[PDB]
Design a protein around this ligand. Structure first.
Ligand SMILES: [N+]
Ligand SMILES: [N+]
Ligand SMILES: [N+]
Ligand SMILES: [N+]
Lengths: 28, 28, 24, 24
């Protein structure tokens, strides 16, 4: 369903934001 | 950090959307 | 950059949630 | 209702992400 699929997208965005945050630390 | 905290918020929103989607099914 | 593109995705999702709120 | 309030949260988060993109 649409809400289930939007929930999966939000969880994926959360993992993508943590990856960015981690890249950013490494480099600084 | 701020991105880590926003990631947690997005994961929490995903669980809240699935709960809404489930409530909605039960009732329909 | 990337964060702006993610922000745009979140805005698009917001619009989708408002639409779901008002369907039958 | 609730979904609208979540949509508003997502928009607020979008603004926070754009701000992070432009800090040092
Ligand atoms: N994404
Ligand atoms: N929330
Ligand atoms: N979406
Ligand atoms: N936030």
């Amino acid at each position: 369903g649409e809400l289930k699929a939007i929930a999966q997208e939000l969880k994926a965005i959360a993992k993508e934001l943590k990856a960015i945050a981690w890249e950013d630390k490494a480099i600084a």
